[PDB]
Amino acid sequence: TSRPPLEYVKGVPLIKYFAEALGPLQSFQARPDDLLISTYPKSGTTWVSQILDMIYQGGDLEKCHRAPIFMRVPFLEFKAPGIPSGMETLKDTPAPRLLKTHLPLALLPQTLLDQKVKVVYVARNAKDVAVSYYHFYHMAKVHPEPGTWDSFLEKFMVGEVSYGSWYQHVQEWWELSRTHPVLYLFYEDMKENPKREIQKILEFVGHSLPEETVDFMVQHTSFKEMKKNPMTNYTTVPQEFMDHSISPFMRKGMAGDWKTTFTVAQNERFDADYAEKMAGCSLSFRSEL
Ligand SMILES: Nc1ncnc2c1ncn2[C@@H]1O[C@H](COP(=O)(O)O)[C@@H](OP(=O)(O)O)[C@H]1O
Ligand SMILES: Oc1ccc2ccccc2c1
């Protein structure tokens, strides 16, 4: 009940509240005009969510401020003390709907694949993911005790963390994109050049918008502005759920900062394990710009 342990479901370790959440998510019916944001945690979920809302409100910042990002974009598997569940919020979210998930394919509602819903997947280099994930486990108190960074890094390496293996995740959603319509984006690409990536998102969802407006989205989806913005920075939630004084949700927003956490030994060891997990995969990751 106090940083409870994970619960395994069909091979996926989950926050127990999210596992419970899968029951009522059995009753979820996807529409053809839905869009699923899919990511392994800490990969840029909130960032594309805010890009996709701004696209959906025609650039209108003021509408984007109607509520926090987690109410504008129902988080499918979500459940937590004192906050409405993904499924509850979904009931008051109007089509065309933006949905957020981290579920491995093993757990994904089949209705999203049968209905051919557009997915925007965001992948990020595992080193920055592990580091962000580690800080995230401290502030987001439903998560089990993270322990030392070292022991969290080893845990992360055998996917013995919330939502399981990053390795299997970025690969399985990469393969899905052959039989299913997936825009597969990279957080690093979004760091290098946010406007290229936003226009690709737009190409994907079929909106054209003017450059006055694009440029405008760019600036309002930057790290500095999304840190300032309380409908995107998660400071509106109760302190018993997320404690930003331990670690803020919007942390550094950088690519390449893993280097200030990983030791040299951790790095050599991670890289050897990495080359072995990722062998036979066309996927190429930039671990810095
Ligand atoms: N506008 C933005 N630009 C770059 N990174 C952003 C961002 N908004 C949030 N992030 C980062 O994306 C990560 C959160 O991902 P998710 O939303 O998938 O949980 C955090 O990274 P760090 O902890 O590396 O700073 C957060 O700082
Ligand atoms: O992607 C997310 C977002 C918010 C969360 C809050 C608590 C636990 C996991 C979470 C994962």
Side-chain angles (χ1 to χ4, degrees), residues 83-100:
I83 318 187
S85 80
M87 281 301 288
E88 290 167 357
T89 309
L90 186 87
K91 285 167 200 152
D92 301 297
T93 320
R97 314 187 290 197
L98 288 174
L99 319 159
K100 164 170 157 194

Side-chain angles (χ1 to χ4, degrees), residues 4-281:
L6 294 176
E7 182 165 311
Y8 280 74
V9 180
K10 285 176 213 204
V12 180
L14 301 166
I15 293 173
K16 189 170 75 305
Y17 295 117
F18 294 21
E20 289 167 12
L22 304 174
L25 186 64
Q26 206 71 9
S27 296
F28 170 69
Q29 297 160 110
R31 293 169 53 102
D33 61 343
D34 278 337
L35 187 137
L36 180 79
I37 292 145
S38 184
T39 71
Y40 188 88
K42 322 311 308 169
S43 297
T45 317
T46 312
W47 188 5
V48 282
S49 289
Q50 183 75 350
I51 291 156
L52 285 153
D53 197 43
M54 281 195 62
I55 293 160
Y56 276 38
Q57 314 290 149
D60 190 312
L61 192 80
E62 282 48 51
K63 279 175 188 160
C64 290
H65 220 82
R66 66 193 175 282
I69 193 65
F70 67 87
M71 309 292 276
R72 298 182 270 149
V73 180
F75 184 11
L76 294 175
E77 64 265 36
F78 177 81
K79 197 197 222 95
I83 318 187
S85 80
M87 281 301 288
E88 290 167 357
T89 309
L90 186 87
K91 285 167 200 152
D92 301 297
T93 320
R97 314 187 290 197
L98 288 174
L99 319 159
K100 164 170 157 194
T101 193
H102 306 301
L103 293 167
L105 288 178
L107 288 184
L108 194 74
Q110 193 48 36
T111 184
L112 295 147
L113 305 179
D114 297 334
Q115 289 286 58
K116 290 281 148 191
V117 327
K118 290 171 183 193
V119 176
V120 172
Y121 189 89
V122 191
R124 175 169 196 208
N125 84 78
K127 293 174 174 181
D128 285 319
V129 161
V131 176
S132 173
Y133 215 175
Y134 181 65
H135 294 291
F136 190 58
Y137 255 56
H138 277 111
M139 70 89 80
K141 316 201 93 180
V142 296
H143 282 101
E145 278 295 341
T148 59
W149 155 249
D150 197 70
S151 109
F152 180 90
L153 180 65
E154 291 291 331
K155 225 104 156 210
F156 179 99
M157 273 185 294
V158 300
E160 197 165 303
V161 294
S162 189
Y163 285 101
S165 169
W166 168 95
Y167 309 83
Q168 201 208 336
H169 206 289
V170 304
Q171 296 192 76
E172 74 180 357
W173 286 83
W174 168 263
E175 188 153 0
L176 176 64
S177 60
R178 297 185 223 172
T179 65
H180 192 94
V182 180
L183 185 65
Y184 202 117
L185 296 187
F186 292 77
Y187 175 110
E188 295 83 14
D189 294 357
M190 297 170 86
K191 269 263 101 138
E192 180 178 60
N193 189 353
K195 183 223 45 266
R196 189 192 40 222
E197 300 313 307
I198 292 180
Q199 178 53 63
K200 279 161 54 183
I201 295 175
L202 279 168
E203 218 278 2
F204 190 60
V205 307
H207 298 224
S208 208
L209 235 45
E211 216 155 81
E212 313 102 67
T213 314
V214 163
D215 285 339
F216 179 86
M217 295 193 288
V218 166
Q219 292 290 322
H220 279 100
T221 58
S222 64
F223 177 82
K224 211 156 93 58
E225 295 291 317
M226 288 185 57
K227 189 179 182 64
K228 287 173 173 280
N229 178 5
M231 302 305 150
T232 70
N233 69 5
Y234 281 90
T235 59
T236 76
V237 304
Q239 191 91 315
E240 40 272 33
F241 182 68
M242 292 182 168
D243 188 0
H244 302 270
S245 78
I246 298 170
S247 196
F249 188 91
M250 298 294 179
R251 203 185 56 89
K252 284 177 187 186
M254 280 311 313
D257 203 39
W258 59 267
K259 289 181 170 194
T260 56
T261 306
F262 274 64
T263 65
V264 176
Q266 287 167 356
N267 192 41
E268 280 169 22
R269 201 201 133 61
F270 194 89
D271 277 354
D273 173 85
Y274 184 83
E276 177 193 288
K277 296 258 182 69
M278 295 314 270
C281 197

